[PDB]
Design a protein around this ligand. Sequence first.
Ligand code: HEM
Length: 291
Amino acid sequence: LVHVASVEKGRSYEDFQKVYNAIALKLREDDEYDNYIGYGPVLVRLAWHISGTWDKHDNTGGSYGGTYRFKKEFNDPSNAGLQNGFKFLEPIHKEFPWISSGDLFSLGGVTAVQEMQGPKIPWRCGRVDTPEDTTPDNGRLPDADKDAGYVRTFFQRLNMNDREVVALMGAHALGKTHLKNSGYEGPWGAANNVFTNEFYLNLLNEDWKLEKNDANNEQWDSKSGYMMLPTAYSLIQDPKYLSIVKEYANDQDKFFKDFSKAFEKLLENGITFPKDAPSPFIFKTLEEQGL
Ligand code: HEM
């Protein structure tokens, strides 16, 4: 497969900034979702799962084709709970019927991170909706009960190196786990809809205890009422991962710059951009626009 980015016919920067604004105004408005966490965290989880299916070996999966719209991918067990972010974005797609699905699903994750005070993420338009038979089979997304060796190997398929894996994993300061979606339950920390380096500080400073939960899965629980997935607690057991965790725990600006680069790479894997194509867009937040 080659997947060439094609801009939506006739659309420029300001068209896309209007779609960003619609998502951002609806995030402000629907603030009650999930006990007042809001839709921000489930929207960056949606942008990572439609991107996370990519296989570097045959160029299949990834964000390009917007295939989460099809039943197979939509009903993937690993995607349970993401229907909420889909339903959030659906009125915005009736409003801007010209945007492709992969562009809208990835822009929703960019808008959520920046509206939750995260770094600016450069974004490129040009994904093209591909057919129902290009939809990847279930099972390409990662397990939660594994170790640092599994993590390294998994992310090699999306060719992410150690630093990019540790930067991307910082998104787990956002939102929470839900027992009915994944067999895990509890918040990651205290500031769950503000983008910060809290994941790393918690990993290095809490007194974590291993326990079984009500679904019979193990998780790490701390005295503060926070939890950690086994795959994510793995990052302090590997010496390479642990030196990068400590770097981000001490320097939130370094974490923001690295997360920005890594998240854009994740949302663009598998897509070829011609050089006639527009440069990456940097969207203004609602606040910067006075809206
Ligand atoms: C090996 C890597 C990862 C595993 C095993 C994993 C697993 C999980 C699990 C089991 C949940 C909770 C699902 C639920 O019950 O609703 C979760 C939530 C979440 N994940 Fe990950 N994750 C991984 C990587 C990532 C990455 C790379 C991102 C984004 C860059 C990300 C962003 C999120 C966010 C924001 C949530 C919270 C969603 C909400 O509040 O509903 N995760 N993850």
